């Protein structure tokens, strides 16, 4: 199928670039993740007022920058005035593709359904084989599929109630993976999480594991107990995850 995402080796992506150590969703963090041995990065994107795809996790720039505002209401020049940490500026998606190796993997998380059309266009110009589009919002994925029906797609899940919809959503959206939080383990329990992942995999879907707390990879050997049931891990601390997987003898 897609040899960039279907591999025998576990794929490690930096979360928001490398958010344990460098400013989230910054060019600096992305370069540092690659240097630290990640296969690629995950980034969060929105559409600015003047139709530019920019990286930002929250719906406002308040938390990560020295300015205030909703990026959807701000032009790119307004946005480029912020400092998002260490002197970094808010990047555009085009700027990300300029700094990434041409074979590096990029998981674009669409936070804004309005951005899908421009994401699709930019992706098409920048080697789509190494891109995964993901979102929590079914309607953002649906919109993306109007423009690009071949790029690898993952459904992010944050609700148990989404899980029974997965067979139909796989067909509707041509999903490749389901992108599951490690936080499912404390909330619903390890065995129920395991059995849910098993069931999703039986549909022909691959699995991306993510988390807002990297400790959950390591406590109780959670990630080790899921070996063979995931293809991608999105880690906040790239170095720690690369070193861990190598210590297990598997990457």
Find the helix or strand (DSSP H, E) in which 52 lies.
none
The experimental method, as deposited, was X-ray
Written as one string, the DSSP assignment of 106-169 is: EEEEE--GGGHHHHHHHHHTS-GGGEEEEES-HHHHHHHHTT-SSSEEEEE---GGGGGGHHHH
Q: Does the annotation flag 160 for ligand binding? A: no
- The CA distance from 80 to 90, in Å, is 6
Packed helices 116-124 and 138-145: angle between N→C axes, nearest 10 degrees? 50
- The CA distance from 101 to 42, in Å, is 14
Resolution of the solved structure (Å): 1.6
Q: Does the annotation flag 109 for ligand binding? A: yes
Angle value at C-alpha 176, between 173 and 180, nearest 5 degrees:
100
Q: Does the annotation flag 42 for ligand binding? A: yes
């Amino acid at each position: 199928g897609n040899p960039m995402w279907e591999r025998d080796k576990i794929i490690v992506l930096g979360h928001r670039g490398y958010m344990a150590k460098y400013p989230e969703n910054s060019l600096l963090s992305i370069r540092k993740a690659i240097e630290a041995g990640a296969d690629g990065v995950e980034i969060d994107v929105w559409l600015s007022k003047d139709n530019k795809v920019i990286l930002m996790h929250d719906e406002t720039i308040d938390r990560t920058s020295n300015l205030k505002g909703r990026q959807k209401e701000m032009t790119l020049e307004e946005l480029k005035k912020a400092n998002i940490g260490m002197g970094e500026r808010i990047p555009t998606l085009e700027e990300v593709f300029e700094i990434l190796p041409k074979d590096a993997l990029l998981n674009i998380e669409i936070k804004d359904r309005d951005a899908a059309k421009e994401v699709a266009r930019i992706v098409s110009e920048n080697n789509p084989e190494r891109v995964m589009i993901s979102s929590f919002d079914i309607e953002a994925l649906r919109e993306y599929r109007k423009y690009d029906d071949t790029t690898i797609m993952g459904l992010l899940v944050d609700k148990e109630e989404t899980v029974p919809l997965i067979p139909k959503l796989k067909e509707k959206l041509n999903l490749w993976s389901v992108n599951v939080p490690m936080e499912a383990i404390p909330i619903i329990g390890f065995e129920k999480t395991y059995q849910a992942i098993k069931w999703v995999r039986s549909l022909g879907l691959k699995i991306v594991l993510w988390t807002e707390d990297d400790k959950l990879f390591y406590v109780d050997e959670n990630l080790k107990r899921l070996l063979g049931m995931f293809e991608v891990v999105i880690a906040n601390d790239v170095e720690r995850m690369v070193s861990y997987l190598s210590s297990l003898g598997i990457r």
